[PDB]
RNA sequence: AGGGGAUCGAAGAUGAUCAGAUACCGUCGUAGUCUUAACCAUAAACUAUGCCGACUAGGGAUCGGGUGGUGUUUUUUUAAUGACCCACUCGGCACCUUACGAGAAAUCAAAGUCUUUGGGUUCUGGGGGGAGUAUGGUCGCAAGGCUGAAACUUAAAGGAAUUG
RNA sequence: AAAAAUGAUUAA
């Protein structure tokens, strides 16, 4: 997307799946962008501040979207003892 | 005028969404052609073929006409629409609507050195529809479009000016050939390349940012 | 896979298989049998 | 960090145990396998209530992030979830769908029943397969009340519970609504329990 | 019977990549396989990989980063001159700017860019892009 | 699935899997120190013996071969390892 | 046959929706009321509409009818939909658990009143 | 085209079964393919059960039954309406009811 | 060629039906059907899916073997065993859902891992006919089998599916 | 489970 004199030349940079790192195409109508609101003290959702995950239509159709979300939430601290790396 | 029915149409009419690249980035389903009209006004149209299809009945054969319409500006957007109708004009008009709905972004790359604007495809791509397989291969500057006239016209309406094409199957099935080339040219942003390896901050959707004034009652 | 040999030393098999299946073409069969010379009203000529 | 007040409180632990939300399906799919605790003689498995409550908290965090509360659509075609989803829709904004789903609700933009939600919560993926599929057509994330044999296709946030029991279904909907209200400026009493008792979420004939 | 453990290795990696797996098991994991993995690891198409030492042939657990489109062997291993490397890259690679054809030269197993820098040639082994 | 620790799997999982299909294959048979009431001699036997091993004193029969593990005689004590 | 078409059925259903209290069990006054609660181009159609309206009324009297919600029905439904029992069907009322359930409680690290039950295959 | 995954019979693993004869026409049909029905009928009709009960020396007689395995060829089963040709999607249903 | 030879039954006879019936239907019935010793080598010999190897999906069954049990069961009313139950595992005949994939489609867990085309290897095909014919060879007692053209002719023949 | 054969050429 880069030409000789800098000046990035591209229509847009597509998003990548947060679980499989595959490109989410413009016509991928089975894909999602899960949005988890950050929580401050004593349990307030503080709207506008979010942790975001992009899941592809492929993984959702395969049925590992929930496990992928468990892993991502575990790694990011959203969940505590849900996903086990060693099955 | 145009009274939007969906949240995307409401945002686009209100002016919160200004370019179709936001649509493509968030992969928002598009249901009203007025969105495409107001985001890409310079979207020109072409009719590829008109063919009759017939259904046998008690009282002879009833004939309808199926129109293939390619829309697109020469700056990286095309859409393909196939519509059958009782009248040729009606089929063409509805085909124009359908192609505008089905507009898709394509990825222009370089064959060799990146001197100037992109002139070819970033990667060889292949699409299939029925028996027809269409393969587009990057070509050096000054090569032109090496394709049959229909696929060539679709590629010019896509903005590609240097590409080789290799076809297989019953290419005389024009609708299958054009659908196969549409799939191939749409897979360009589906193919992952090292320059797209960098992680992105995953932006939030306009349907969530400009959401308080959408779906107003 | 593909039902044909692939090894680096299978060239004889590939060439012979192509030679044998070449006989199923029309023009190759006519050229190799000399049918125009033998069984054709003209002796391979355009006019007579 | 994450506050420890969200842990599995003794009271709602007693609620889940009384509702038999841990008695999972006899047969478990590998996608639901991480949610099982252990199998009992006669084959009935036990759902890890800790996982259930944690996933419910995560689902509530999903819900309390859409800027609008009315574009969070709940679906239940089953009789055991009609009242639960109706009460959830009464307490939150959350426009509901009880009974038949009317295919074409998320596509078919000219329908009168047409809706454009940003999140879909379904009681049962089997009975509500049409809603999940049409969300797969229109880019809608899905929370689902899942049993150990319920399919995981297109289900984003699963809540492993018992789907064969009205008590479990109603209680899980009750807890989800309570947590959503707590994660808002409306139910500040995080330690204190919700006012009304959860039997209004339970279906009773006719 | 097995005739190319490299072919089985790359097929298993390709199938795991296509199915979205982030890790794959490879057996019997020869040292040609190990060199192939080191080349693709150098270019970033895979992550860390682990040699399991069983006392018979070994195993590899490869960590996949989703950046790989396709990897596979070219069987048989054709001899390639200097000037046929360009033809092989044109035939096998999606673009002229990325992707690598793996060669086994007398100087060792390397990618075609490294071979052209070293002015060396050998037999063709596989590709990755 | 779709993300697993193939290098460090569960001991229960490997105990479930086939003997040839673990991360590193190995035997699941074992050896038994066997004591008969006849004498004080200790006989080392194989779990899946596939013979009728006999004691030096009780020199008629100690175990009976079967399809898998050897069926040790009822008048016999044994100890693993 | 005497099957009443959709025009009669829908017009009667709309009348039930709008004027359930005003309408009465008998055809004579239902027909008279139709003269002003509706505009029908023909006396025959008005009579058919009133006849089906009074038939639906005579069915509504002895139990409800699907697809029709008169003004006195939705308040009754919502009032019924607020039945809160005095004692919870599930509460501290005696809980009964299994050995595995006790193991799950201990693993999660909570203290509750449990009772031992052994499931037998 | 191929009509049925199990071609017209139940034979995947052997190759030859044995032929049985149709009860109606005595057409030779492989046993795996024959339409087989169990005719379990009371030896006396319902119109006669009351009468034989009245006209029996043995009070509360056993009222015996008759058992018969009937083998039909495809043609006779269809003609006798035993099988009743079904639709394409309903063709896969294996349930006896 | 010898034995056997109940039954059923190419041929045949004969009664019907029919415009004709040297067909279907009915009643008989030689050869065959069975066997021994020799021949023959062909079937829609079919899964119309070569063989070997690897990987990719979600289940419930079942056959054979093996392993284990806060399991049961007729024996000792608390013993190996055998028989059932549960959890596994290897091998097999197969099924159910869906295809993410493939295919022209019907459909397919292979007919997937194919223009992103290379795991190994054998055999076969190249528009429809003429034609599996002619001829030569070879095998067979024969019937015939295996191998196997050309002249000439022709714009379709053909597959799957849609509507009537 | 009685019998029931036939329909010139071209002409979307
Ligand atoms: Mg047919
Ligand atoms: Mg056979
Ligand atoms: Mg067959
Ligand atoms: Mg054959
Ligand atoms: Mg078997
Ligand atoms: Mg031919």
Curated annotation (Swiss-Prot), chain A:
Misc: Present with 27400 molecules/cell in log phase SD medium. There are 2 genes for eS21 in yeast.
Species per Swiss-Prot/TrEMBL record: Saccharomyces cerevisiae (strain ATCC 204508 / S288c) (Baker's yeast)
Protein name: Small ribosomal subunit protein eS21A
Subunit structure: Component of the small ribosomal subunit (SSU). Mature yeast ribosomes consist of a small (40S) and a large (60S) subunit. The 40S small subunit contains 1 molecule of ribosomal RNA (18S rRNA) and 33 different proteins (encoded by 57 genes). The large 60S subunit contains 3 rRNA molecules (25S, 5.8S and 5S rRNA) and 46 different proteins (encoded by 81 genes).
This protein's UniProt keywords: Acetylation, Cytoplasm, Ribonucleoprotein, Ribosomal protein, rRNA processing
Pfam families: Ribosomal_S21e (PF01249)
Function, as annotated: Component of the ribosome, a large ribonucleoprotein complex responsible for the synthesis of proteins in the cell. The small ribosomal subunit (SSU) binds messenger RNAs (mRNAs) and translates the encoded message by selecting cognate aminoacyl-transfer RNA (tRNA) molecules. The large subunit (LSU) contains the ribosomal catalytic site termed the peptidyl transferase center (PTC), which catalyzes the formation of peptide bonds, thereby polymerizing the amino acids delivered by tRNAs into a polypeptide chain.
Cited InterPro entries: Ribosomal_eS21, Ribosomal_eS21_CS, Ribosomal_eS21_sf
Chain segments annotated as transmembrane: none
Encoding gene (name): RPS21A
UniProtKB/Swiss-Prot annotation, chain C:
Compartment(s): Cytoplasm
Domain of life assignment: Eukaryota
PTM summary: The stereochemistry of the 3,4-dihydroxyproline has not yet been determined.
Family to which the UniProt record says this protein belongs: Belongs to the universal ribosomal protein uS12 family.
Functional note: Component of the ribosome, a large ribonucleoprotein complex responsible for the synthesis of proteins in the cell. The small ribosomal subunit (SSU) binds messenger RNAs (mRNAs) and translates the encoded message by selecting cognate aminoacyl-transfer RNA (tRNA) molecules. The large subunit (LSU) contains the ribosomal catalytic site termed the peptidyl transferase center (PTC), which catalyzes the formation of peptide bonds, thereby polymerizing the amino acids delivered by tRNAs into a polypeptide chain.
Assembly: Component of the small ribosomal subunit (SSU). Mature yeast ribosomes consist of a small (40S) and a large (60S) subunit. The 40S small subunit contains 1 molecule of ribosomal RNA (18S rRNA) and 33 different proteins (encoded by 57 genes). The large 60S subunit contains 3 rRNA molecules (25S, 5.8S and 5S rRNA) and 46 different proteins (encoded by 81 genes).
Other remarks on this protein: Present with 10600 molecules/cell in log phase SD medium.
Protein name: Small ribosomal subunit protein uS12A
Taxonomy of the source species: Eukaryota, Fungi, Dikarya, Ascomycota, Saccharomycotina
Gene that produces this protein: RPS23A
Part of the full-length chain shown: 2 to 49 of 145
UniProtKB/Swiss-Prot annotation, chain D:
Subcellular localization, as worded in the UniProt entry: Cytoplasm
GO biological process terms on file: cytoplasmic translation; endonucleolytic cleavage in ITS1 to separate SSU-rRNA from 5.8S rRNA and LSU-rRNA from tricistronic rRNA transcript (SSU-rRNA, 5.8S rRNA, LSU-rRNA); endonucleolytic cleavage to generate mature 3'-end of SSU-rRNA from (SSU-rRNA, 5.8S rRNA, LSU-rRNA); ribosomal small subunit assembly; ribosomal subunit export from nucleus
GO CC, any one term: cytosol
Effect of loss of the gene: Reduction in growth rate, a decrease in free 40S subunits, an increase in the amount of free 60S subunits and a decrease in polysome size.
Listed GO MF terms: structural constituent of ribosome
Modified residues (N-acetylserine): 1
Keywords of this entry: Acetylation, Cytoplasm, Ribonucleoprotein, Ribosomal protein, Ribosome biogenesis, rRNA processing
Post-translational modification: N-terminally acetylated by acetyltransferase NatA.
Family indicated by similarity: Belongs to the universal ribosomal protein uS2 family.
Its job: Component of the ribosome, a large ribonucleoprotein complex responsible for the synthesis of proteins in the cell. The small ribosomal subunit (SSU) binds messenger RNAs (mRNAs) and translates the encoded message by selecting cognate aminoacyl-transfer RNA (tRNA) molecules. The large subunit (LSU) contains the ribosomal catalytic site termed the peptidyl transferase center (PTC), which catalyzes the formation of peptide bonds, thereby polymerizing the amino acids delivered by tRNAs into a polypeptide chain.
UniProtKB/Swiss-Prot annotation, chain F:
Keywords: Cytoplasm, Metal-binding, Methylation, Ribonucleoprotein, Ribosomal protein, Zinc, Zinc-finger
Essential cofactor(s): Zn(2+)
Compartment(s): Cytoplasm
GO terms under biological process: maturation of SSU-rRNA from tricistronic rRNA transcript (SSU-rRNA, 5.8S rRNA, LSU-rRNA); ribosomal small subunit assembly; translation
Residues with PTM S-methylcysteine: 39
Any one Gene Ontology molecular-function term assigned to this protein's record: zinc ion binding
Pfam family, one: Ribosomal_S27e
UniProt KW Cytoplasm keyword: yes
Zinc finger (C4-type): 36-58
Processing and modification events after translation: The N-terminus is not modified.
GO cellular component: cytoplasm; cytosol; cytosolic small ribosomal subunit
Principal cellular location given in the protein's record: cytoplasm
Cofactor notes: Binds 1 zinc ion per subunit.
Other noteworthy facts: Present with 43300 molecules/cell in log phase SD medium.
Function description: Component of the ribosome, a large ribonucleoprotein complex responsible for the synthesis of proteins in the cell. The small ribosomal subunit (SSU) binds messenger RNAs (mRNAs) and translates the encoded message by selecting cognate aminoacyl-transfer RNA (tRNA) molecules. The large subunit (LSU) contains the ribosomal catalytic site termed the peptidyl transferase center (PTC), which catalyzes the formation of peptide bonds, thereby polymerizing the amino acids delivered by tRNAs into a polypeptide chain.
Similarity annotation: Belongs to the eukaryotic ribosomal protein eS27 family.
Protein name: Small ribosomal subunit protein eS27A
């Amino acid at each position: 997307m880069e030409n000789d004199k800098g000046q990035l030349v591209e229509l847009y940079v597509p998003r990548k799946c947060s679980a499989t790192n595959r490109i989410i195409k413009a016509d991928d109508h089975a894909s999602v962008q899960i949005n988890v609101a950050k929580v401050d003290e004593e349990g307030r959702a503080i709207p506008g501040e979010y942790v975001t995950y992009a899941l592809s239509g492929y993984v959702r159709s395969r049925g590992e979207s929930d496990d992928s979300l468990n892993r991502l939430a575990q790694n990011d601290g959203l969940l505590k003892n849900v996903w086990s790396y060693s099955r | 005028g145009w009274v939007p029915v969906t949240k995307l149409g409401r945002l686009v009419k209100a002016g919160k969404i200004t370019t179709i690249e936001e649509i493509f980035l968030h992969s928002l389903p598009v249901k009203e052609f007025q969105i495409i009209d107001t985001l890409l006004p310079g979207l020109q149209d072409e009719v590829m073929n008109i063919k009759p299809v017939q259904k046998q009945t008690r009282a002879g054969q009833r004939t309808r006409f199926k129109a293939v319409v390619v829309v697109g500006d020469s700056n990286g957007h095309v859409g393909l629409g196939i519509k059958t109708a009782k009248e040729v004009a009606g089929a063409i008009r509805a085909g124009i609507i359908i192609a505008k709905l089905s507009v898709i972004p394509i990825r222009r790359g370089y064959w060799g050195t990146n001197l100037g604007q992109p002139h070819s495809l970033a990667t060889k791509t292949t699409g299939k529809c029925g028996s027809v397989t269409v393969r587009l291969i990057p070509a050096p500057r000054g090569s032109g479009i090496v394709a049959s006239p229909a696929v060539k016209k679709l590629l010019q309406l896509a903005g590609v000016e240097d590409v080789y094409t290799q076809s297989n199957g019953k290419t005389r099935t024009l609708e299958n050939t054009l659908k196969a080339a549409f799939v191939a040219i749409g897979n360009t942003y589906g193919f992952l390349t090292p320059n797209l390896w960098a992680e992105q901050p995953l932006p939030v959707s306009p349907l969530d940012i400009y959401s308080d004034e959408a779906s107003a009652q | 896979g593909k039902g044909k040999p692939r090894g680096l030393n299978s060239a004889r098999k590939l060439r012979v298989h192509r030679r044998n299946n070449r006989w199923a073409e029309n023009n190759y069969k006519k050229r190799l049998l000399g049918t125009a010379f033998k069984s054709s009203p003209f002796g391979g000529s355009s006019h007579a | 960090s994450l506050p420890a007040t969200f842990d599995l409180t003794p009271e709602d632990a007693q609620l889940l145990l009384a509702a038999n939300t841990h008695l999972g399906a006899r047969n478990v799919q590998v996608h639901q396998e991480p949610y099982v605790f252990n199998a009992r003689p006669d084959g009935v498995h036990v759902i890890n209530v800790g996982k259930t409550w944690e996933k419910l908290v995560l689902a509530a965090r999903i819900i309390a992030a859409i800027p609008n509360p009315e574009d969070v659509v709940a679906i239940s075609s089953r009789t055991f979830g009609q009242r639960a989803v109706l009460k959830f829709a009464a307490h939150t904004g959350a426009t509901p769908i009880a009974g038949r789903f009317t295919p074409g609700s998320f596509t078919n933009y000219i329908t009168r029943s047409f809706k454009e939600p940003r999140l879909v919560i379904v009681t049962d993926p089997r009975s509500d397969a049409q809603a999940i599929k049409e969300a797969s057509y229109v880019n809608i994330p899905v929370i689902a009340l899942t049993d150990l044999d319920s399919p995981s296709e297109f289900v984003d946030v699963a809540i492993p519970c018992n789907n064969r029991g009205k008590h479990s279904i109603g209680l899980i909907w009750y807890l989800l609504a309570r947590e959503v209200l707590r994660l808002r400026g409306a139910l500040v009493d995080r330690t204190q329990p919700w006012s009304i008792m959860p039997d209004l979420y339970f279906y009773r004939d006719p | 019977t097995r005739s190319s453990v490299l072919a089985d290795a790359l097929n298993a990696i390709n199938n795991a990549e296509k199915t979205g797996k982030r890790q794959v098991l490879i057996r019997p994991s020869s040292k040609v396989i190990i060199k192939f993995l080191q080349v693709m690891q150098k270019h970033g198409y895979i992550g860390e990989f682990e040699y399991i030492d069983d006392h018979r042939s070994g195993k590899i657990v490869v960590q996949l980063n989703g950046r790989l489109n396709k990897c596979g062997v070219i069987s048989p291993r054709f001899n390639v001159k200097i000037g046929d490397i360009e033809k092989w890259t044109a035939n096998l690679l999606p673009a002229r700017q990325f992707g690598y054809v793996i060669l086994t030269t007398s100087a060792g197993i390397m990618d075609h860019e490294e071979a052209r820098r070293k002015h060396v040639s050998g037999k063709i082994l596989g590709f990755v892009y | 699935v779709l993300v697993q620790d193939l290098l460090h799997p569960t001991a229960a999982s490997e105990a479930r899997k086939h003997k040839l299909k673990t991360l590193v294959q190995g035997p699941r048979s074992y050896f038994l120190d066997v004591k008969c009431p006849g004498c004080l001699n200790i006989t080392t036997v194989f779990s899946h013996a596939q013979t009728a091993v006999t004691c030096e004193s009780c020199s008629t029969i100690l175990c009976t071969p079967t399809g898998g593990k050897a069926k040790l005689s009822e008048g016999t004590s044994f100890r693993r390892k | 046959g005497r099957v009443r078409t959709k025009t009669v059925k829908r017009a009667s259903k709309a009348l039930i929706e709008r004027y359930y209290p005003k309408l009465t069990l008998d055809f004579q006054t239902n027909k008279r009321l139709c003269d002003e609660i509706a505009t029908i181009q023909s006396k025959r159609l008005r009579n058919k509409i009133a006849g089906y309206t009074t038939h639906l009324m005579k069915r509504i009297q002895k139990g409800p009818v699907r697809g029709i919600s008169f003004k006195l029905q939705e308040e009754e439904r919502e009032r019924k939909d607020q039945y809160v029992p005095e004692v919870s069907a599930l509460d501290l009322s005696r809980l009964n658990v299994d050995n595995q359930t006790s193991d799950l409680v201990k693993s999660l690290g909570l203290k509750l009143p449990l009772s031992v039950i052994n499931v037998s295959a | 085209p191929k009509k049925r995954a199990s071609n017209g019979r139940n034979k995947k693993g052997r190759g030859h079964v044995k032929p049985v004869r149709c009860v109606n026409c005595s057409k030779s049909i492989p046993k795996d393919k024959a339409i087989k029905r169990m005719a379990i009928r009371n030896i006396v009709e319902a119109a006669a059960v009351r009468d034989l009960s009245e006209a029996s020396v043995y009070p509360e007689y056993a009222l015996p039954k008759t058992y018969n395995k009937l083998h039909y060829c495809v043609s006779c089963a269809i003609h006798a309406r035993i099988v009743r040709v079904r639709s394409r999607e309903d063709r896969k249903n294996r349930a006896p009811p």
